[PDB]
């Protein structure tokens, strides 16, 4: 809805959103949107478990395992810049 508002306001509306979605839409049809400037802050997405879960620690270890194995980067490229239509 925000991006649609950007496209239909013809420059009269700017949308503040996480860099990820911005970078994604920048690569998507009809490639009429753009990410401008740097970022306002720097944070990250994480997998959340109910505190005291028997699943917490192995999931965490799994996440950083996947990060070091290049899995996360490969997936990022898969869904962002491989399916990207203007890249």
């Amino acid at each position: 809805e925000g991006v649609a508002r950007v496209r239909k306001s013809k420059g009269k509306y700017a949308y503040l959103l996480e860099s990820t979605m911005n970078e994604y839409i920048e690569q998507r049809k009809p490639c009429d949107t753009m990410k401008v400037g740097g970022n306002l802050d720097s944070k990250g997405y994480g997998i959340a478990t109910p505190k005291g879960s028997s699943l917490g620690t192995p999931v965490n270890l799994a996440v950083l395992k996947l990060s070091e194995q290049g899995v996360l980067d490969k997936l990022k490229n898969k869904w962002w810049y491989d399916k990207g239509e203007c890249g």
Binding site: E18, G44, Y45, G46, I47, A48, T49, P50, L55, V59
Partner: protein, 48 residues
Amino acid sequence: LTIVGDGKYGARDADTKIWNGMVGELVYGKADIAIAPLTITLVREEVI
């Protein structure tokens, strides 16, 4: 895999003090884990 009921990420209303969204589903035991673009916050790290 299940889609969060109210389609929200999560926050606490400062009146009801109830968590909504995926965080809400985690805290209140409606789901076992959340795998989504969930941004890490202070208040969320406090409850999950």
